[PDB]
Design an enzyme around this catalytic site. Structure first.
Site, PDB file in Angstrom:
ATOM      1  N   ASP A  35      38.768  35.849  39.831  1.00 48.81           N
ATOM      2  CA  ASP A  35      37.930  35.276  38.783  1.00 48.81           C
ATOM      3  C   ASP A  35      36.744  36.191  38.473  1.00 48.81           C
ATOM      4  O   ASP A  35      35.749  36.189  39.199  1.00 48.81           O
ATOM      5  CB  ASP A  35      37.426  33.897  39.242  1.00 48.81           C
ATOM      6  CG  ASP A  35      36.532  33.215  38.215  1.00 48.81           C
ATOM      7  OD1 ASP A  35      36.490  33.697  37.070  1.00 48.81           O
ATOM      8  OD2 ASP A  35      35.879  32.194  38.570  1.00 48.81           O
ATOM      9  N   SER A 199      31.882  42.622  21.433  1.00 46.86           N
ATOM     10  CA  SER A 199      32.984  43.014  20.584  1.00 46.86           C
ATOM     11  C   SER A 199      32.462  43.362  19.200  1.00 46.86           C
ATOM     12  O   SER A 199      31.467  42.807  18.740  1.00 46.86           O
ATOM     13  CB  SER A 199      34.000  41.865  20.502  1.00 46.86           C
ATOM     14  OG  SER A 199      34.989  42.113  19.528  1.00 46.86           O
TER      15      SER A 199
END
Length: 330
Positions: A35, A199
């Protein structure tokens, strides 16, 4: 040193991925959910409330000659999906894919919430976010990656998740045979303890690319892709019959649909998520309403590039002094 381990979807929907991990001496092998969005290595154990264990493999520290109680240490964690666990702490030897850390904090669960109990395939979590998020008190502990770093050939790990298929986590090296083209690296902020990056935009299907900065985290422990409501609306507008359902808890779509791809930007590069990756199947057994793999982050407070996005790429988690993230197509 290096390590290399295969990671396997837990079910036919890729709801999560499990990776075998050796703990203790002699080895006890548990299947953990790696994770990158948390920083605790915790396991179902001989200490876990019996009514809260349902099919998981447990760690039994009393059977490990290298286990030592970390006296006075406790831990308690709550995840974004409302699940939680807590307990005490041992140190022991932990190996992943041939890479061994001695003195790793292994957090032994005394209590786990129902969603953990109900998932018989996941024996615990191995956190790979920054150690500043580790919940052990009063002495915070380091992640497996942080402990391994000094021994690693290069201070990196890579995630290569499969779509409906196994993939790989590598530690300490970049497998240049595992991706196509070049890896594009992008800046990381560690201010929130996550692999947080920006992004450069998105496209829906064969549509034009929208240049727009989207801050978010690279999180292998989250199944879906969570993005701003504007982006998610633009995506689902291209699917006939798609709608956001408050009763179901997100966007659903007719199972008869063929989904468009979704592209996200990494610098000047582009990663394309095929439409099929975005189909998470019937909302309930036998339903013709299917759950979407792209969902709104509104009210989560953060955008999350979870498995739906990451499995479309070869992803480099570069833990150098100035951390960065790399993405390549594959």
């Amino acid at each position: 040193s290096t390590g290399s381990a295969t990671t396997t979807p837990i079910d036919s929907l890729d709801d999560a991925y499990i990776t075998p991990v050796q703990i203790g001496t002699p080895a006890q092998t548990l299947n953990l959910d790696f994770d990158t969005g948390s920083s605790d290595l915790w396991v179902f154990s001989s200490e876990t409330t019996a009514s809260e264990v349902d099919g998981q493999t447990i760690y039994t520290p009393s059977k490990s000659t290298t286990a030592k109680l970390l006296s006075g240490a406790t831990w308690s964690i709550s995840y974004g999906d409302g699940s939680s666990s807590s307990g005490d702490v041992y140190t022991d030897t932990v190996s992943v894919g041939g890479l061994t850390v001695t003195g790793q904090a292994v957090e032994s669960a005394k209590k786990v919430s129902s969603s953990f109990t109900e998932d018989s395939t996941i024996d615990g979590l191995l956190g790979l976010a920054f150690s500043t998020l580790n919940t052990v008190s009063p002495t915070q502990q380091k992640t497996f990656f942080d402990n391994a770093k000094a021994s690693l050939d290069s201070p990196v790990f890579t995630a290569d998740l499969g779509y409906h298929a196994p993939g790989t986590y590598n530690f300490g090296f970049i497998d240049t045979t595992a991706y196509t083209g070049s890896i594009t690296y992008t800046a990381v902020s560690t201010k929130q303890g996550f692999w947080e990056w920006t992004s450069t935009g998105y496209a829906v299907g064969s549509g034009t690319f929208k240049s727009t900065s989207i801050d978010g985290i690279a999180d292998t422990g989250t199944t879906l892709l969570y993005l701003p409501a504007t982006v998610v609306s633009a995506y689902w507008a291209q699917v006939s019959g798609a709608k956001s359902s408050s009763s179901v808890g997100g966007y659903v779509f007719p199972c008869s649909a063929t989904l468009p791809s979704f592209t996200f930007g990494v610098g000047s590069a582009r990663i394309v998520i095929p439409g099929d990756y975005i189909d998470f199947g019937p909302i309930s057994t036998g339903s013709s309403s299917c759950f979407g793999g792209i969902q709104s982050s509104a009210g989560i407070g953060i955008n999350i590039f979870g498995d739906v996005a990451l499995k479309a790429a070869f992803v480099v988690f570069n833990g150098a002094t100035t951390p960065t993230l790399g993405f390549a197509s594959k």
